[model samples]
Target: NAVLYKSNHNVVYSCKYHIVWCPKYRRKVLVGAVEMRLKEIIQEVAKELRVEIIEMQTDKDHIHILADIDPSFGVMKFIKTAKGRSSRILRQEFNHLKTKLPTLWTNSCFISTVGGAPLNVVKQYIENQQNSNRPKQKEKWKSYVDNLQT
Candidate 1:
C-alpha cells in the first residue's frame, strides 16, 4: 500500500531517485535571493518535464533533490535540462554569477535509487505463501526464514 506507481502508454513503474549536484568550482554562491530563485527554476523545470519533486533543498555550494521521474523521459534528461536552463537564466538575471563562473554547474552529478522496502522484507513476504495442493515443507521453510531473519 505504501508503493506509488506511475504509468504511461508503454509501461507502469515507480522510479525514485536522490540526486545531488554542485555549482561549478563548488562556489558558495547559493544564498538569499539566488537560492530562492534557483529553487523556483528547478521546480519549473520539473513541472514542464512531469517529474514529481518529493523534496528539495540547497546548501551554499550544493543541492539535493528527491524526485519520482518517469522511466521513459529519464533522470538524465531532467537533470540536463534543469542545469542548462537554470544556468542560462540565472546568469542573465544575476550579474555576479555571470562574471564569477563560466558555467553554473559541473558536468558530473550524484544520483542514487531510493524509496523501497528492504530485500529481506520482500523475501519474507514471498516465503510466507503456501501451495494449496502441495504438503508444507515446514522444516525447509523454517530454515529459509531463519536465514533471512539473521
Candidate 2:
C-alpha cells in the first residue's frame, strides 16, 4: 500500500524508486529468527518512510528486498537503517543471531532494480524463495557474474 509523502521537491524529484540488497559473508540470513525480525522492521520502515516493500525475503543466508524509498533517505541511508537497526535489534533481542554472526556485517552486499514485475507479485515471489541453500545459490550467482560481460 502506498501512502502520501511530503518532502523537499529538490530531494524527491519523483515518487518512485526501488532497490534490493543482501547480507554479507557466510550468507546466513533470513532464518527463522532474522526473517521475522526483518519483516517487522521492513513494515516499520516502510510506514515511516511512506514507501513500500514491494518484496522482502530472507532465505537462511541471504535477503532480497524490493522497496521504494523516499528520496530524503536514499540508498546507503536506508541500508544503514535496515542492516544497522536490524543488527542492533537482533543483538538486543535474539541471542542466537548475535552468537552465530559477526558483530558487524561486511560492507559489501547485493543490490538491484525491480524491472518488470508488479510489487505484490515480486513480494510474494521473494517471500516464497526462502530456506534456499546458500551454497547452491552461489553457482547460479556466479553464472550471472560471468555472463554479465557480452
Candidate 3:
C-alpha cells in the first residue's frame, strides 16, 4: 500500500530511501548488547531528525535502513548525525568497541531512492538479512518480482 505524503511549511514530498552502512573494516562487532544498543541509538536519532523509519535491521557487520526522510532536512545530514552519534555513544559505552576499532562506521555508505520497486519487497529484503546465509533465501528476490506482477 502507498503511504501518505508528508508536508511541511512549503513542500509536500514522499522521499523514501534504502540506506546500508557497515562498520570500519566490516568487522562483526554488532552482536548481542551492541546490536540492541545500536537499534536504540538509531531510533533516537531518527526521532530527533523527524525521519520516519519504515523498517530497519542490522547484520553482524552491516545495517539496512528503510526510511522516509524530508528533502529539506536532507539525507546526508541524517546519515552524518546517525553515524557520528552512534560511533561516539557506542564507543564510550562498550569498552571492546572503543579499543578494537578506531571508528564504529565507515565514512561512506550505500543509499538508494526507492523508486519503481515495491516498498514491501525492499522491507522483506532488509528483514531477511539475518537468514541470508541460506541458498534458498538468497534467491528470494526472484519471487518479489513475481509477487509484484499480481
Deviation in angstroms for 31 in model 1?
0.7
Count of backbone collisions within predicted model 1 = 0
* Cand. 2 Cα-lDDT: 0.60
Q: Judged by lDDT against the true structure, how good is candidate 1?
A: 0.83
Span of ten consecutive residues with least summed lDDT in model 2: 141-150
Which of the predicted structures, 1 or 3, would earn the higher TM-score when compared with the native? 1
Local lDDT at 10 for model 2: 26
- Where model 1 places Cα greater than 4 Å from the true spot, the runs are 1-8, 117-150
Per-residue lDDT, model 2, residue 110, is 62
How well does model 3 score by local distance difference test? 0.82
Considering every candidate listed, which one attains the maximal TM-score? 1
Q: Evaluated with lDDT, which candidate comes out highest?
A: 1
lDDT of 2 by residue, 22-113 (tens): 55555665677667877797677666655566677666666667766565666566777777777788777877667776763567666655
| lDDT sort, best first | 1, 3, 2
Q: Summarize candidate 1's per-residue lDDT along 67-148 as a digit string, tens digits.
A: 8887777999999999999899999999999998899999989999986545676565566556784366634555553210
Alpha carbon RMSD to native, model 1: 10.9
| TM-score computed on alpha carbons, candidate 3 | 0.71
lDDT of 3 at 83: 93
Model 2: colliding residue pairs: 27-61, 28-61, 29-60, 29-61
Tell how far residue 129 is off in model 1, in angstroms: 21
